[PDB]
Symmetry: D5
Subunit: 139 residues, 10 copies
Amino acid sequence: GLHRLIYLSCATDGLSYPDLRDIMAKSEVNNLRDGITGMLCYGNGMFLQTLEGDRQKVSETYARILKDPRHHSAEIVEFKAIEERTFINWSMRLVQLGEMDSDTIRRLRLKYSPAATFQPRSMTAEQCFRFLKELYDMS
Amino acid sequence: GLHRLIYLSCATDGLSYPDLRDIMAKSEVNNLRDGITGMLCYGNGMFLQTLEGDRQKVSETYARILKDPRHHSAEIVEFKAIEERTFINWSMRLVQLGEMDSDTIRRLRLKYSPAATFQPRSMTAEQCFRFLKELYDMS
Amino acid sequence: GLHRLIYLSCATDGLSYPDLRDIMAKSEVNNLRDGITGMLCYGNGMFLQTLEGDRQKVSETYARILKDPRHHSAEIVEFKAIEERTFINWSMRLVQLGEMDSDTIRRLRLKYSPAATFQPRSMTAEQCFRFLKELYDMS
Amino acid sequence: GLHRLIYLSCATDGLSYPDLRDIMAKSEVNNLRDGITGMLCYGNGMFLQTLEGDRQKVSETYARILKDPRHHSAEIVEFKAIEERTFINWSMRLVQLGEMDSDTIRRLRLKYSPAATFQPRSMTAEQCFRFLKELYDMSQG
Amino acid sequence: GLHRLIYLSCATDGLSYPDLRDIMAKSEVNNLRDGITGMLCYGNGMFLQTLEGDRQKVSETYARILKDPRHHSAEIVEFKAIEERTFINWSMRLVQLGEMDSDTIRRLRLKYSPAATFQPRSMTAEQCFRFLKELYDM
Amino acid sequence: GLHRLIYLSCATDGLSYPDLRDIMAKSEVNNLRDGITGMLCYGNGMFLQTLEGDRQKVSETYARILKDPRHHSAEIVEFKAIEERTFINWSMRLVQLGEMDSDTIRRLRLKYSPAATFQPRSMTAEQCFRFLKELYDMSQG
Amino acid sequence: GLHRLIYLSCATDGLSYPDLRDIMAKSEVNNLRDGITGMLCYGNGMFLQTLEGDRQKVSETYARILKDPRHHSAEIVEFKAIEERTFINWSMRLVQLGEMDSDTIRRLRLKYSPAATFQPRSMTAEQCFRFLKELYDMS
Amino acid sequence: GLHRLIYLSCATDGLSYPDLRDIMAKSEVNNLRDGITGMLCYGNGMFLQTLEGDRQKVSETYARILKDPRHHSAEIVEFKAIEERTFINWSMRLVQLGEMDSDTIRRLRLKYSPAATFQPRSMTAEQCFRFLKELYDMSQGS
Amino acid sequence: GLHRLIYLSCATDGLSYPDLRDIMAKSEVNNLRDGITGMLCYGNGMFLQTLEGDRQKVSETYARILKDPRHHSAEIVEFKAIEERTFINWSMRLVQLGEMDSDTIRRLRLKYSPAATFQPRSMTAEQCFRFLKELYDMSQGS
Amino acid sequence: GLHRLIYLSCATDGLSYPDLRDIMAKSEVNNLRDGITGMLCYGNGMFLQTLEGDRQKVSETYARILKDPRHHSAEIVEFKAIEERTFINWSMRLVQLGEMDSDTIRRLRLKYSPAATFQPRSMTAEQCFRFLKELYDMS
């Protein structure tokens, strides 16, 4: 069945631009292959990602993701069955908050969180979903 | 009363347009006679069809379809009473995914399924329904 | 309070144009007097009528209609309380399906029934209501 | 398919018990033939009956009832499709408010009605149904 | 996923008791093998059956059933996904309305149908389900 | 808290324009003072008014109204707490059906009632509300 | 149709016991005649009553009550249509909170109000309803 | 998690313009620091404020607010969790009813209250929220 | 109208039994006076309390509680209107988790929170309510 | 906040009784420490486990479980917030379907799955939850 996974993690000190590109390059390729789609949000040293696809494939990808030393302290936010995909457009799209309009992002971060900075650990499943959805719609 | 049937099947190897034309020519005659309407979706060697009409007639048409050597491994996706028809316009309309806007089809496939290719067996009733309805609206 | 009655009947062989005219003449006058409004659908030798108004008045009108030899085999489709009327503009409007554009009536009839021709007996209460409502809104 | 009808009417002045006994007699026979069930409530000179069964059959039975001179001023209370019957065990049981506890029926009446006496005309469809159902369940043995 | 199929059919004229037994013998075996359960109702010359199991398996079983000459004029009542099974206890159980308390089935049949006799064609999907469920509970 | 009252009454025979002016004159002043807003419908010799505001204030205003000999046979339609007001614009506005589009009112009256003429007594609370709201939305000038 | 009125009022200073007996005497007779039932609560110099019955009847009885100099500052708590009555047993029953068990009423009072003493003006419609219903049930 | 607090209070007699400005300036600073947003409505000698943010932070802010002698007779109107904020744009902006279009305020005040003047104590939590939201929506300028 | 408040706080280091008795003594008197009822829970150095009553009275009681030096770091859990009271029986009642049957409290604390020990800050408003509810429904003397 | 994770996996070939004991020993100690509770079901060579607790702790425990060589092919079934725990009684309880009453498990396995044997991969989140709860209530 079709499912959506949402999880967050902490970028590991030393995360470089080529690291991000490498991650995206591999993600796009593997997801296209596995029928997975989604978005990756990176800001304030934090990662927030959502993956949509088959139950077995999405789980396998997450298990693989947990092995990447480029981040740590991963936390599952949500995993449930869905009737339709929300994040259809990309196999995997990387959105860097630091490159967005300061006002637009601070307002979005406030809208769906109680934090003074991007802190996904302070956000519920629904707030992460709606947060990513707005970023997706902007892309 | 008024019912809707949805089922999927695998096209028998060697299938060509003549077969589809024949299927369509007879479907239109029989369906118009039996008060049946619907749409037939063909793509990636798979069949996804829906019929609306009388409980008895729709069931009879299905039994006749199961005897057709042009496809096999049929699977019922759904059968239930409905308040009104969605596939009203045609006694039977053929839609070939390979001949529709490929960009539109790819997004549609991802939207209602977890597969990398058109695979109705990985889709739920509602998914097949919404998928077919969008195709219907495109015609 | 306010109620809506829906019933169907079989026109008696030999039903002429002037008979309908006489039925309509009496209907408009009587319903206006009783505060009743509605629509009379005639097609395929079948009658499908809806009456809105007082519980007592609508009941008395139906009883009176049952005495009319111009039709027979009357069948009640539904009778229930309603918050507001739908068929407001006419004390009684006559709608002959043969006076409508073929394809338009074809689609509408298929949309709310599994029949290949107008057959109210094969329609549910809601189907008859929605059918009559579209005919009403069309004008 | 399966539908339920509820209507009310005024009993003709002079209506006696035997005339009511003849009704129930002819009703039980026909309702058994047409696959119709339900019950008839009589009180304060008013009739409140519910019939369950086929759409056409229930409709035809009602058209036949309208010709009966034993009552008049009939009013349909409701007609709708039902998933299952409520008055199953009864083809056509009779119930006279002027029978059981004049205190029980009194409470039941008030519960589903604003009238000081039995007056189905002042009752809604749901009130009529609930009223009849409670009676049904009451007289079961 | 888990699904439930309900269909009705007309028993072929001349249906014998040994035919019923052959039907049940085959059902039990194949249904156990395919993880399918359900109940077969036979009365007034009509058949009313429900099958629960996988979408593919139940589908194939129906296709097979359609080829059986012991009945005809098959009509699908419903096919939908379900969260849990209702007819568990039997890979396939047969219930003959004729061998039941004439008064019991009389009230059951009336409860979920407008007909004066067992007529599944005049019953809705929900009515067939409830009918079968109560039958299942006896 | 905030509540809405809806009631109906029969205008006294011989209701003149001065009587109407006086009623509206006093209504506007008092309602303004009490923080009450609403609309008064007059047609077919009947009154259908709605008052929104404080529970005690609306209640007292109704009590005074019942003392006005310029109408009678008053009947309460509804009284309940509301989250927000609908009839906000006027402390009290008079809407005379006979001064509006004859066909427009006929259809509006039919839309929310089973009567052949304006008869609020045959209408439910929901019907009276929507009827008034539609009149309110039209009489916005 | 069937409706329910709930209102509160201030007993006029000087309210004697014979007044209550007289109020009840007339109430029992009139309500029985008008098909009205309900409960009358008196306490802390305040009245709280509910009347169920016809819309016209209940409205007229309230109008009469408003002319009774034995009380004043009447406030309507609610007036709505109901499918069935709650206070069926009595055409009118009087309950004097001052003659009930201390703790018993203390709890009831607190349960449906923020007041330490009986004050219906501080209670919502639902609160007055449930409060009156429990008194009804205890009797 | 994310929460919203709404409370009302009476301005202390003698409060002046500079007093109000001092409240807003200090509030914006602290709220910005604590991830809190909201609006302060002032009218008819009454205060109606909403704060959105963290459960701990908003609570502590309210504690501090209670110590401010510039107002008194404070009453909590509501405190609950929320899926998303409504008052996103301002750390804490002051909105004076007396500065807005009299006719606009009057209709807004009547819409969500039974009072003839601005009286937050006569309003429910839902009315206060909707009142503040509309005020906020019509104060986004151009 | 009738409302319910729920808040948590940290007991000040050194909190003694006499202090709890004093807190309870005054609470009972004041609450009885103010028409307030409620429950007080104390465990693992934390307080979880709920108060039901008038919007104004409950708010003032909370403001008073905030000035109490015997606890600190208060956090409001919820404040909303209610149709009827749940904690009706006592002007105030104290339940000490440290004195309850081990298995009983362990199970209750797990049931409404993700913590291995009592920690109201990790609990939602609903969780706090149901938790207090069960303590309230628990017969005195268990 | 309080969350519940449900996941399934395949027991590595050779998994025996002693393996399960060691798993339980460590699970009870670690879960008690992390405030985690739940239940582990083992049957037909498959694992079905649910964990309730903190978002972060539950997530970290799952990451550790994924590194255990005693199983493989892990698939997440569900991860969502919950108002209250269902599997309260144990830090971790093991249930071996093989030691259960053959007919008790057959009935339960059929009730929540379309499989002829225990196959969690063919079950939904609701089915897995209800299946686990019924086992929990009879532990």
